[PDB]
Write a protein that binds this ligand. Structure first.
Ligand SMILES: [Mg+2]
Ligand SMILES: [Mg+2]
Ligand SMILES: [Mg+2]
Ligand SMILES: [Mg+2]
Ligand SMILES: [Mg+2]
Lengths: 143, 48, 95, 92, 52, 354, 110
RNA sequence: UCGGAGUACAAAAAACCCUCCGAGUGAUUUUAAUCUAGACAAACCAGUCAAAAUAACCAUAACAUCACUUAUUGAUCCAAAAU
């Protein structure tokens, strides 16, 4: 027969993002008694220090995937007062384009109740939404 | 005939359902507003 | 239980067992959970569902009910549109 | 599908467009039945699927309604992909 | 502080009644419940009084 | 019985007595920062990371790549402080900042990011996507030189291929254009490798486009060892990875064992191992560029399978393990009537002798 | 006499699955009256503080930091009253999944 | 009769006409569904949890909450409602 016709029916996909992108990967349900919830694939974390603002996307294992910080020279040289709301929206838009480049479209954001009412982080969420990255990571198929 | 009568009555009662819901909500809101106004005026007259 | 009747000399059966129990031909006995119609306003939805569900009997109760009933109630019945005809038999029992 | 002359040309075209996922490389449309233990019922299911496809391609009032539970993710992904594709530079 | 048991019938047309506890010193009760027959939020009103 | 602690206790440093004079935090987010800092330390007790695969914790990754560029720290700091001062001296920037109406040169920011710190983010994204683990299994490299890859999907429509992007096979049917800054004194090689999608060997990978002895930037002028083949991911298994590896070489590498014929439509011949390739030609080439994208099945993959590869399109599906059920009991006590349905082979009535 | 009602059966509030035990989905790992063991990865919490496995795997017990829900007023007050260097620790029960999510099997060549 | 603490110091169980607290329910609205894996406990009867899937609300929760929340409860048969 055809030399290429061999199939090896046990197909193995070694891509670590394969099931995450197919939305059939095993989300880490669980803790329930601590905060924030760890049921996700990629989580957005915003650290607002007294001098700089940094925004990360992290995997379930805690590894840093894509990060944008006002400590970076690229944003520092184009930005003034790296702590303020314009700095927050700047880093939000930069992280949005970086996530789009990296292939991440869905994240989860779990801020504190006082942080959700802040003026800067609402603008960061709006900047992500207008940049194309959407929160509310999709539900797992056959959860 | 029994099945058709049941379905017709169900449709008739479901057609007006949002109207009854809104009327009940308005009645409850008026009740709570009247209670709040009575309490506020009682407190105001007691203060003086 | 009347092991030897005074008229025919046969073995009698108690009617309470057949009135409140059902026997599948595989030997299992099916019953309703006690208290499934009592004070439903006082019970949680999960508890009400658990009471509504049908349940089986263990070996001791099954043997007791077999002793109380006669051989007419252990026969194979082919009813018209029987709800439990699919459950009359046991499959894939590895003992 | 090409040699099936018992249905019209537009119907054949519609089956070719829609059910190309289940069309063999030789052009043979293939229908699968696995539900019942009886080959009679299996063939009945195959014929019912064939009749349903024929009727769906024959009716002109097909609005092509699409589901939304699993299509929002695809829409978002296409949105974000053409957000990068929108670069306009001549090439080739 | 004695309560009362009242049977409420659905106003969605279909016959569906559920029993709930209410205070005696309250007016005729009217709430929003779920009717399995129509699978929608339906206004329920107190129809009968059963238990004290 | 009691056992002595096998190391320092967590809260044994601060003094229990005289809590009033001891400083306290009043901020939940501050406590959160402290707790997340503590949770990452290698404690001597059983932790979540140890059981859930910290990947052997720290690993001394072997670096096979170009040295980082040498810059003057003092001069760089002086220029950066000067730029910050000259920016802060402005008053229109202050007014824009206070009025919250100020925009950002996103293209510029991306340019300096890719110039100064892009390689490290790209390397960590390659680590997260598992490129190094499947290409060398023991080595990591930093993509020092940017590599811009783009497909042409029309007359004015260009699809960029960043790190981890998703590209349709229809968009990737044609060969792409690759650009990277390089002087006219060096030689480069470019390799497009399909990591996942080999039907037979799980540990092997496919070749798609191998060009060698590239003079500087003109890739079209350099000879192509392997003709371009469009991506052909299977219908069932989706989201395969395709990696563009760029190697900078000193000598003019010439080989005959890695050369492919003109058609090159045989999957047996298009079987590759990047580890073996780099072991064979490790002395000259050094990896300096990386560009990988995800790719799923579309309507053109069947055409690629049929016309080009001359085979039947394979179809897979994501099957799940059958539900677990305990051993069936002779007398299932207090079990629902549906207990017998959990061990039924088929929902059909079998009459054994009737 | 004067003391009445002291008789009541034990509620069997305890641990059901120890470390290393292979559990399936839905198995009750441990039941409790107050929060003694906290759920972690792939361990869900019932309404009666019981802990049940959500995935089939191996049960593990760990000591981990405790960051409470910011809406929990009592725990937030405790945290804000904690001293500078103090971090809370709790015993969490985890289920480490064993079987993969699924497999890619060939069905037909079209 | 039911629950909590000690007896019963660390998985479970464990008695006395042993030592002390309690319950035979209130307040409020979020009026809290169906179906089903797998489990706890248990002589039996009873009691408890619960993933996935379904129709309505954010298109991101629904386990009703509080009073130490744990106890606030009664089997068949038989009688009544409108089934
Ligand atoms: Mg410096
Ligand atoms: Mg006791
Ligand atoms: Mg006792
Ligand atoms: Mg047991
Ligand atoms: Mg659910």
């Amino acid at each position: 027969p055809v030399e290429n016709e061999a199939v090896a029916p046990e197909f193995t996909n070694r891509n670590p993002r394969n099931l995450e992108l197919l939305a059939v990967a095993r989300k880490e349900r669980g803790w329930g008694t601590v905060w924030p919830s760890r049921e996700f694939w990629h989580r957005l974390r915003v650290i607002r220090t007294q001098h700089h603002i940094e925004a990360l996307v992290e995997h379930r294992n805690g590894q840093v995937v894509v990060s944008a910080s006002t400590r970076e020279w690229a944003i520092k040289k184009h930005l003034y007062s790296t702590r303020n709301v314009v700095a927050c929206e700047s880093v939000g838009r930069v992280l949005a384009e970086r996530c789009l480049e990296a292939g991440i479209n869905f994240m989860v954001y779990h801020p504190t109740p006082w942080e959700a009412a802040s003026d800067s982080i609402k603008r960061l969420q709006h900047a992500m939404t207008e940049g194309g990255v959407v929160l509310r990571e999709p539900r797992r198929i056959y959860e | 005939q029994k099945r058709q009568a049941r379905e017709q009555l169900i449709e008739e009662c479901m057609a007006k359902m949002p109207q009854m819901i809104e009327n009940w909500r308005q009645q409850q809101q008026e009740r709570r507003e009247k209670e709040q106004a009575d309490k506020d005026r009682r407190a105001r007259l007691q203060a003086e | 239980v009347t092991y030897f009747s005074s008229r025919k000399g046969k073995r009698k059966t108690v009617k309470a067992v057949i009135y409140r129990f059902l026997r599948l031909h595989s030997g299992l006995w099916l019953r309703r959970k006690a208290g499934y119609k009592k004070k439903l306003w006082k019970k949680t939805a999960a508890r009400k569902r658990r009471l509504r569900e049908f349940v089986f009997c263990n070996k001791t109760q099954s043997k007791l009910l077999d002793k109380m009933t006669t051989s007419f109630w252990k026969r194979r019945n082919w009813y018209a549109d029987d709800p439990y005809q699919k459950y009359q038999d046991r499959t894939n029992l590895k003992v | 599908l090409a040699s099936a002359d018992w249905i019209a040309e537009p119907v054949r075209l519609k089956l070719a467009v829609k059910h190309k996922n289940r069309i063999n490389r030789s052009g043979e449309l293939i229908l699968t039945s696995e539900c019942s233990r009886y080959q009679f019922r299996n063939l009945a299911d195959c014929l019912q699927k064939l009749r349903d496809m024929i009727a769906e391609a024959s009716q002109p009032a097909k609005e092509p309604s699409r589901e939304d539970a699993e299509l929002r993710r695809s829409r978002i992904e296409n949105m974000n992909r053409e957000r990068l594709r929108k670069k306009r530079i001549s090439s080739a | 502080s004695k309560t009362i048991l009242v049977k409420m019938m659905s106003q969605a047309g279909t016959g569906f009644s559920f029993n709930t506890k209410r205070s005696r010193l309250r007016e005729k009760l009217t709430l929003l419940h779920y009717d399995p027959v129509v699978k929608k939020k339906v206004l329920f009103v107190e129809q009968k009084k059963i238990r004290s | 019985r009691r056992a002595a602690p096998l190391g320092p206790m967590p809260n044994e440093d601060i003094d229990v007595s005289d809590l009033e004079r001891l400083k306290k935090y009043r901020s939940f987010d501050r406590y959160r920062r402290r707790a997340e800092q503590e949770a990452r330390k290698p404690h001597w007790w059983r932790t979540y990371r140890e059981h859930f695969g910290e990947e052997s914790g720290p690993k001394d990754r072997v670096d096979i790549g170009l040295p980082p560029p040498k810059v003057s720290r003092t001069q760089q700091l002086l220029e950066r402080k000067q730029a910050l001062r000259e920016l802060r001296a402005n008053v229109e920037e202050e007014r824009a900042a206070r009025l919250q109406t100020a925009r950002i040169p996103l293209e510029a920011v991306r340019a300096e990011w890719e110039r100064t710190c892009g390689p490290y983010h790209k390397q960590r994204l390659a680590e997260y996507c598992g490129l190094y683990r499947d290409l060398f299994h023991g080595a990591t490299f930093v993509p020092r030189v940017p590599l811009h890859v783009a497909y042409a999907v029309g007359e004015d429509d260009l699809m960029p291929v960043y790190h981890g992007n998703e590209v349709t096979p229809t968009e990737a049917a044609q060969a792409p254009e690759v650009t990277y800054e390089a002087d006219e004194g060096s030689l480069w090689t470019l390799l497009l490798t399909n990591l996942d999608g080999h039907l037979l060997e799980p540990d092997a990978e496919y070749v798609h486009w191998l060009v060698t002895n590239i003079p500087g930037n003109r890739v079209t002028e350099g000879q192509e060892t392997c003709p371009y083949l469009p991506p052909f991911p299977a219908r069932g298994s989706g989201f395969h990875r395709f990696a563009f590896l760029l190697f900078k070489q000193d000598k003019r590498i010439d080989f005959s064992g890695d050369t492919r014929p003109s058609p090159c439509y045989q999957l047996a011949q298009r079987t590759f191992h990047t580890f073996d390739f780099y072991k064979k030609h490790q002395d000259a080439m050094t990896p300096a560029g990386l560009a990988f994208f995800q790719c799923r099945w579309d309507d053109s993959v069947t055409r690629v399978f049929h016309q080009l590869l001359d085979m039947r399109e394979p179809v897979f599906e994501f099957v799940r393990p059958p539900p677990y059920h305990p051993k069936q009991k002779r007398f299932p006590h207090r079990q629902p009537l549906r207990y017998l349905d959990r061990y039924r082979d088929s929902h059909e009535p079998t009459y054994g002798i009737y | 006499s004067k003391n009445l009602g002291g008789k009541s059966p034990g509620k069997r509030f305890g641990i059901k699955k120890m470390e290393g035990h292979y559990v399936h989905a839905g198995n009750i790992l441990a039941t409790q009256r107050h929060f003694r063991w906290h759920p972690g990865a792939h361990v869900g919490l019932g309404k009666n503080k019981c802990l049940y496995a959500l995935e089939e795997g191996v049960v593990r017990y760990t000591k981990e930091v405790y960051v409470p829900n910011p809406s929990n007023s009592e725990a937030v007050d405790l945290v804000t009253r904690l001293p500078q260097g103090a971090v809370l620790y709790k015993t969490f029960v985890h289920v480490v999944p064993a079987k993969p999510e699924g497999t890619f099997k060939l069905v037909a060549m079209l």
